[PDB]
């Protein structure tokens, strides 16, 4: 209109959510509980010698 140009109003997103990126250390000692559980049950068997004889 005349010399000036008119532009439409811009709609705005109401909310934003922040989810930052985190470094991944990738440690291996955690989630190894099964090995500890296996260590718990060694179960060495010893039979008395001389009771039979």
């Amino acid at each position: 209109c005349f010399g000036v140009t008119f532009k439409k109003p811009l709609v705005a997103e109401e909310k934003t959510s922040l989810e930052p990126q985190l470094p991944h250390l990738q440690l291996r000692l955690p989630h190894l509980v099964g090995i500890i559980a296996k260590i718990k049950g060694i179960k060495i068997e010893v039979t008395s010698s001389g009771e039979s004889i």
């Binding site: 811009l10 705005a12 997103e13 109401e14 909310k15 934003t16 959510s17 922040l18």
Partner: protein
């Protein structure tokens, strides 16, 4: 010693390295951040 140069018409030029924007219009907006730890 000294170093010399004669300005021809008494007009010199300065670098002036900052930009010049020449704004057109100003807008206003609203927004919510919603910080959550979950």
């Amino acid at each position: 010693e000294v170093n010399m140069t004669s300005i021809p018409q008494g007009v010199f030029y300065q670098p002036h390295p900052e930009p010049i924007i020449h704004t057109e219009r100003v807008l206003g907006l609203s927004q919510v951040l919603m910080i959550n730890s979950e």
